[PDB]
């Protein structure tokens with residue numbers, strides 16, 4: 001409350017990589033102001049014109065120095081999606097190899113939803129868990145948002161499952177790491193919402209990390225979230241998150257445990273338990289899990305694996321994990337000899353990636369519409385404002 | 396090269412002279428919030444959501460950063476067209492200052508200057524005992540503030556109004572003006588408005604120049620190119636007076652004209668080109684050759700009369716056309732009580748006898764207008780982004 005304390009408090013607020021007003025967010029704010037005002041229509045205003053004239057030389061210097069997309073050499077497009085694409089890239093100067101998620105600022109504004117990336121940035125940047133893919137640098141430009149993360153050369157669980165008939169001992173491993181990776185996110189106060197094999201990545205050692213925190217939400221004072229959002233491909237989604245079509249309720253971290261059952265069922269049975277041709281067909285079967293969940297006759301599935309799946313594929317009220325992680329960990333399906341929960345990431349993985357080089361992309365299938373841009377505004381529309389403060393740098 | 400790019404950018408945020416230091420960056424965000432926060436503009440989701448997101452933060456910033464509520468006003472010790480000066484005390488530090496306020500509204504409603512920028516730099520970076528020092532500069536949606544050192548000795552106007560100034564005192568006050576003007580010139584500026592109103596006295600009784608509002612930096616030829624007259628009617632020089640569009644190319648000799656006007660006033664008691672009407676004063680300045688006369692004042696010496704006439708002549712033969720040393724060498728300054736190089740260390744003619752730290756005896760006492768709510772983005776706070784002198788300052 002003293003004068004110096006007020007100065008120091010403000011000075012450290014500019015240095016904090018978690019602050020809303022650090023030098024990177026502050027710069028982002030100016031960079032946006034220049035992007036959204038520089039139009040002939042708006043420049044007819046002297047306040048606007050003189051401002052833009054004054055900061056021209058400077059804003060350009062900043063633009064050149066600050067991290068830019070041209071500082072990375074793209075090696076392969078190792079992933080795609082609605083709004084963006086992931087790409088194996090190499091930093092031209094440092095020579096370091098990374099995975100970079102691009103997100104079109106145009107599309108996110110056209111199709112709304114432009115707040116999902118906020119939890120994706122914070123989780124990866126501040127998590128500090130060997131269970132979460134790490135964000136090194138987040139930066140933007142008039143067209144996209146960029147996330148420079150650690151490259152996972154082992155591929156995703158989708159690829160693994162597609163190449164092996166997963167034995168129970170491997171499934172017990174991959175599930176345990178998911179239980180731990182999920183518990184970490186929960187410990188950070190987040191619900192993943194869409195846990196699936198596509199989001200389970202393998203490091204050089206063959207150990208798991210969760211990725212694609214796009215669907216994440218921060219839990220309230222009672223460890224709960226609420227949404228009016230529509231979810232695509234409901235295969236891994238829980239009956240609660242589906243009954244939430246319009247904010248028609250709340251749900252806790254037990255929604256992530258449902259998806260784990262779906263992941264265990266898939267690795268051992270070979271298919272998703274509620275699969276149907278149409279999306280509406282999948283939804284109907286999830287709602288009717290009581291009667292739709294069935295197992296095949298080839299009892300290549302143990303008594304305890306069948307039990308864990310059914311303990312996870314039940315209504316929230318009696319779902320395993322409603323009373324915390326320790327009741328999942330204590331399950332007989334996890335009873336083994338090879339590992340101990342507290343040292344599982346130090347154990348030797350079932351599948352160890354044998355890799356050719358630093359840029360080995362063998363586990364990632366290669367990838368093959370023109371760029372749509374924001375129109376010239378007649379008035380101030382401030383298209384850049386929803387992304388002010390996205391820029392992150394690690395020291 | 397990398398790292399050099401980081402360092403270059405880091406030093407750009409620290410520099411108190413940079414366009415993108417923390418002060419300017421913080422000002423930019425503070426402006427964006429002030430300017431967008433209107434019900435009309437908030438109808439735009441990009442704007443509304445941005446504001447909603449940065450509400451908590453912007454308010455924290457506003458509370459920590461220097462604000463007008465931090466100072467307890469003691470007396471309005473001065474007024475002007477756009478602002479007012481006020482003796483104030485910092486509520487926290489207990490420190491006593493003089494604060495110049497400038498209505499952001501009045502300025503925007505036809506200013507034709509942006510004078511406040513050089514007034515800021517001269518006072519902040521001058522580092523002369525001849526220039527009033529700026530400690531902090533800050534703003535808000537309504538005003539610009541300059542927190543400077545309080546001059547308790549009053550101005551020369553007050554002194555002249557209370558004493559029949561003897562020649563020995565006039566020789567002192569002139570010499571200090573010659574030195575304080577030379578310092579501004581050495582910084583590459585022409586004061587353009589030298590008058591007793593801008594001569595202030597410190598606790599010791601020594602001079603400092605103030606009100607650098609009319610200042611302008613000289614070109615590499617030591618000249619200024621103004622299409623319009625600047626300064627005060629009595630003290631304006633014939634060349635700064637005539638100063639047309641195509642013409643108006645004057646040097647630092649315009650400050651020497653005003654010194655003659657100051658010397659004449661202290662010894663004679665009136666301004667030399669004084670006339671009833673203001674238009675009468677103009678006519679007499681132009682016709683200085685015939686209008687400058689002295690009364691039957693036996694008390695004005697031969698050398699005082701000569702200095703005045705050496706200063707009250709056409710620029711082409713004005714004393715000081717060949718530098719300060721020809722003014723300093725003048726016989727009027729010949730004395731056995733001080734030496735030019737040690738004059739500020741000598742004992743003043745009038746030493747202020749002051750009651751306390753807040754003694755306002757030398758200052759006589761003096762006893763709404765605002766921007767309309769905009770329907771569209773008008774950006775009224777943009778011309779003042781970067782005014783603040785607080786976070787990145789020169790210590």
Ligand SMILES: CS(=O)(=O)Nc1cccc(CC(=O)Nc2nc(-c3c[nH]c4ncccc34)cs2)c1
Nearest residue numbers: 080081082083084085099133150151152211212
């Ligand atoms: C659905 S959308 O259109 O809203 N967004 C969107 C667009 C394109 C792709 C995706 C998937 C996705 O999230 N991919 C991710 N990949 C990593 C990663 C980190 N390291 C690695 N190493 C190898 C390989 C991938 C990684 C993290 S999240 C999402």
Ligand SMILES: CS(=O)(=O)Nc1cccc(CC(=O)Nc2nc(-c3c[nH]c4ncccc34)cs2)c1
Nearest residue numbers: 474475476477478479480493544545546605606
């Ligand atoms: C005409 S305008 O509206 O464009 N500008 C404007 C508005 C208000 C006042 C004035 C005069 C003025 O400039 N006064 C100044 N006072 C100090 C100072 C510094 N220290 C001190 N101590 C005691 C007493 C005054 C000081 C510096 S400049 C000019």
